[PDB]
């Protein structure tokens, strides 16, 4: 069974999407993950957007795991370079029917009290204690401390194209980040065994966060906009 | 140990490179692996360019294999589309002090009567027996029949940016191909154990070939230009 969907833009009130927390779809058809009040992003914001139907990434009966490819474009504008922008966005895969975890360096996907499994690709802008220099792309499994990391220079408010491909045969998760206007390319790959970590059915989506209050910097912020999104998955069983 | 070099453009008789067969460096600072007379690519051509010094991909004493990243831009101009362009170019790693193999579908890296091992990434423009639809990026290990292959649409005469990266820890070889003018991105990856196929020291370079006489089509040709090239490898021990 193969599943696919694509959004060249988001129409206000998408019946195909589950917006959670601060996530909204602006009038101009862009999906805003964290709050932006009148052209200016706010600190203390956290939002998620999941595809509304669970996609089966593996089947017990056959043991077969799916291969998938997801491509999307996003933009992160950092108005205030002054103290430190934060926190970044992630494309994640988690069990179905979850809720926004902790904000700040957890991007809304990790809940310190009751942790649930998840595979995520992160585009990190704030250097937390467990973090290497930022910004960096990172591969997260059940945690926010990336198994693999690679730094990237941001195209401030520019467009970024992302290709995340997973080969079930090689168990390789490869992500590419291209900033078309700069012409810069960044790649990162790691071996991930979805069958070990996540359940048969999952929800795929994005989560982003702005600076946490307990950091005190009201300028610990930026936008986390996603312009388009496509995903395709093939379970041979 | 760490080794790295960068070619922003090639100069005539670059001491750092070793040209072989038809390969030459034009006055315009471009590396033409295969012959092109008066702006027209010729058939029956093969050329190689290797970096003058050997690099160490692993050490037997410690058993440490090197991680590396290489980036280059190429341009393939297919003037006569009618018959069928041939054959392509490859980035390849081989034992030191080798000689140009068989042109045509072997790109000049394979010699059927005295085979040497190699790890190469190809950009295949002509479909041989052992081939799937072309053009395609393919990961070749000791053979021209790829282990992994991904189809891609060429930007005829246009520029392509390639990023090849190998992580020793995961043994992942991930390659990215981006056509800037076209805004296209293609990604392919595969687990390759350099240690299991190559010697401690190697040569890195490119190789290209136009249509072989044994095909009669004198139009089985295209250019195989290399605009720039940067390389970096790191061996812990
Ligand atoms: C950052 O955002 C949250 C959510 O907007 C603020 O709190 C309020 O949050 C609680 C949920 O824990 C909710 O029940 C309240 O209705 C909500 N109220 C308002 C007016 O925002 C959070 O902080 C603040 O904490 C609450 C308890 C309230 O005292 C408010 O005045 C205070 O600012 C925000 N923190 C900062 C520092 O902006
Ligand atoms: C090899 O390349 C030639 C140039 O691209 C092709 O020929 C010509 O192209 C078109 C027809 O496809 C004509 O409008 C041009 O006037 C031709 N130009 C020249 C310089 O030859 C050629 O295609 C073929 O050869 C031409 C001359 C005709 O006889 C066609 O029947 C034939 O397809 C191409 N070679 C081959 C073997 O396809
Ligand atoms: C294809 O290419 C080869 C190399 O350019 C041609 O061959 C050569 O001709 C000279 C002069 O006789 C010899 O010294 C070379 O050593 C030859 N090379 C080989 C491999 O035989 C070859 O004839 C060309 N074929 C066609 C049809 O143009
Ligand atoms: C947070 O960012 C602001 C805005 O960039 C910083 O404040 C000021 O910024 C410029 C340089 O400091 C001034 O020229 C601006 O006029 C002024 N902006 C405003 C709205 O007053 C501020 O210093 C930063 N805060 C911290 C803690 O670094
Ligand atoms: C000091 O850290 C805390 O606040 C900053 C804001 O300055 C970041 O949000 C970070 O995620 C959070 O842990
Ligand atoms: C017919 O096959 C032979 O000629 C064609 C050109 O037409 C290619 O060069 C191919 O690699 C070679 O083996
Ligand atoms: Ca962080
Ligand atoms: Ca071929
Ligand atoms: Mn991180
Ligand atoms: Mn091939």
A103 lines ligand 5 (CB under 6 A): no
Rounded-to-integer distance, Cα B80 and Cα B83, Å: 7
Nearest atom, ligand 1, residue A213 CA? 37
Considering only CB atoms, B174 lies closest to which of A161, A180, A187, namely: A187
Residues of chain B neighbouring A168 (CB-CB closer than 8 A): none
Considering only CB atoms, A187 lies closest to which of B165, B190, B191, namely: B165
Phi-psi region of A33 (alpha: psi -120 to 50; beta: other; left: phi over 0): alpha
Those residues with Cβ within 8 angstroms of residue B145's Cβ, 6 or more apart along the chain or in another chain = B130
Those residues with Cβ within 8 angstroms of residue B197's Cβ, 6 or more apart along the chain or in another chain = B117, B118, B119, B141, B142
CA of B155 to the centre of ligand 10 (A): 18
Among positive and negative, which fits the CA dihedral B162, A120, A19, A24? negative
Task: Tell me the residue length of chain B.
Answer: 237
Residues A199, A32 contacting (CB under 8 angstroms) = no
Helix (H) or strand (E) holding A178: strand A172-179
**Which residue owns the Cα nearest ligand 5 atom 3?**
A215
CA of A169 to the centre of ligand 10 (A): 20
Closest CA–CA distance from residue A168 to any residue of chain B (Å): 12
DSSP B15: T
Q: Is the peptide bond before B183 cis (omega within 30 degrees of 0)?
A: no
DSSP B104: G
Considering only CB atoms, A174 lies closest to which of B71, B183, B189, namely: B189
Q: Check CB contact under 8 Å for B165 and A189.
A: yes
Rounded-to-integer distance, Cα B60 and Cα B85, Å: 43
**Resolution of the experimentally solved model in angstroms:** 2.5
Q: From the centroid of its chain, how far is CA B38?
A: 24
Helix (H) or strand (E) holding A15: none
Mutate to test the interface with A, among B148, B151, B187, B188 (most CBs of A within 10 A): B187
**Is A170 an 8 Å CB contact of chain B?**
yes
Comparing CA positions, the residue from A145, A193, A187, A201 lying closest to residue A166 is A193
Residues A224, A34 contacting (CB under 8 angstroms) = yes
* Experiment used for this model: X-ray
Q: What is the DSSP string of B186-202?
A: EEEEEE--HHHHS-SEE
Rounded-to-integer distance, Cα B166 and Cα A34, Å: 35
CA of B99 to the centre of ligand 10 (A): 21
Distances (CA, A) of A201 to A143, B47, B224: 20, 51, 46
Tokens (6 digits) for A23: 């996530």
Q: Give me the residues paired with residue B179 across strands.
A: B184
Q: Check CB contact under 8 Å for A189 and B167.
A: yes
Residues B204, B232 contacting (CB under 8 angstroms) = no
Helix (H) or strand (E) holding A194: helix A194-197
Closest CA–CA distance from residue A184 to any residue of chain B (Å): 10
The yes/no answer on whether domain A1-237 falls in CATH 2.60.120.200 is yes
Q: From the centroid of its chain, how far is CA A200?
A: 20
Comparing CA positions, the residue from B165, B113, B109 lying closest to residue B140 is B109
Give the angle subtended at the CA of A67 by the CAs of A145 and A164, to the nearest 5°: 50
Rounded-to-integer distance, Cα A88 and Cα B230, Å: 30
A199: buried, middle or exposed (CB in 10 Å: 19+, 13-18, 0-12)?
middle
Closest CA–CA distance from residue A68 to any residue of chain B (Å): 13
Rounded-to-integer distance, Cα B11 and Cα B6, Å: 13
């Amino acid at each position: 069974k193969t599943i696919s969907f694509n959004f060249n833009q988001f129409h206000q009130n998408e019946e195909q999407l589950k917006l959670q927390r601060d996530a909204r779809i602006s009038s101009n058809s862009v999906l805003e993950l964290t709050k932006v009040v009148n052209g200016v992003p706010t600190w203390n914001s956290t939002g998620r957007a999941l595809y509304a139907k669970p996609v089966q990434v593996w089947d017990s009966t056959t043991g077969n795991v799916a291969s998938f490819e997801t491509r999307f474009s996003f933009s992160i504008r950092q108005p205030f370079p002054r103290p430190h922008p934060a926190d970044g966005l992630v494309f994640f895969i988690a069990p179905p029917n979850t809720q926004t975890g902790e904000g700040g360096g957890y991007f809304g996907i990790y809940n310190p009290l009751s942790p649930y499994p998840f595979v995520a690709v992160e585009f990190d802008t704030f250097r937390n204690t467990w973090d290497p220099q930022i910004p960096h792309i990172g591969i997260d499994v059940n945690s926010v401390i990336s198994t693999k990391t690679v730094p990237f220079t941001l195209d401030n408010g520019g467009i970024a194209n992302v290709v995340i491909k997973y080969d079930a045969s090689t168990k390789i998760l490869h992500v590419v980040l291209v900033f078309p206007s700069l012409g810069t390319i960044y790649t990162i790959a790691d071996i991930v065994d979805l069958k070990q970590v996540l359940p048969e059915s999952v929800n795929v989506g994005f989560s982003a966060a702005t600076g946490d209050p307990s950091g005190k910097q009201r300028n610990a912020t930026e936008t986390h906009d996603i312009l388009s999104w496509s995903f395709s998955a093939s379970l041979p069983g």
